[PDB]
Amino acid sequence: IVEGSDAEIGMSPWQVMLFRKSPQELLCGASLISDRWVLTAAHCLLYPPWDKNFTENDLLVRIGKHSRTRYERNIEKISMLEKIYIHPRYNWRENLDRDIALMKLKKPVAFSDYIHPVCLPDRETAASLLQAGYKGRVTGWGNLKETWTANVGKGQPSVLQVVNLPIVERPVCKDSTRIRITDNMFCAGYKPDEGKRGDACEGDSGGPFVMKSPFNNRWYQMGIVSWGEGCDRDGKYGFYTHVFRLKKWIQKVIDQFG
């Protein structure tokens, strides 16, 4: 996250870290949507241009974390995966259209003060809240600078970072890139003229873009960090998978698989 701030303890209890067993490295963010289902971006698992194709046996999810590198004994829970489900029409060849994947955990995690699921939007929440100028919140352990991420403590944070960003109008999103954008994507960020800055960046993929409903006080996950050209560049915006537009596939998988 570029130009964010350290998250508060318990601020995003649905935030999940996707972690590779060997070498032990952080792959992506993800989010907890029930005691056994994690949502992430499909390119975190499958992206043939970079020879990426992970099976469930390669991965661990770590839930309840705050520090990026520490094993948080007695706070975080680590789970293995039972199955991974990539959207059948994920388009990795051209524009990462339908960038979404579900991961089923081998056993339910117990909730606690640091571990709690986020809600998934219904048609009416998506309708009221996914409007240009309305702000959402992005979280992750990714790079703090476009040029500087590597590890150690260069542009890589000690704890979870958070940034709040406005949704941008679809025209402005389309005219900032040469990539073909679809109805399954939205973009967010500040315009050059707005003075504030902020963006997700490398290592934040798969993480949640969430909004808090003013009607019932609950947090809803509206997007998944998907792609961008650089991080926090003037006139460029981060793109996010539109979770409500792919909600029928989500429901289908959970109803058919547990």
Binding site: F19, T69, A150, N151, A200, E202, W227, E229, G238
Partner: peptide
């Protein structure tokens, strides 16, 4: 393009039984 790429490995070792 897609958002790890420069992933080092400065992580504390997790408990043995998860590997």
């Amino acid at each position: 393009x897609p958002x790890q790429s420069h992933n080092d490995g400065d992580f504390e070792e997790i408990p043995e039984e998860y590997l």
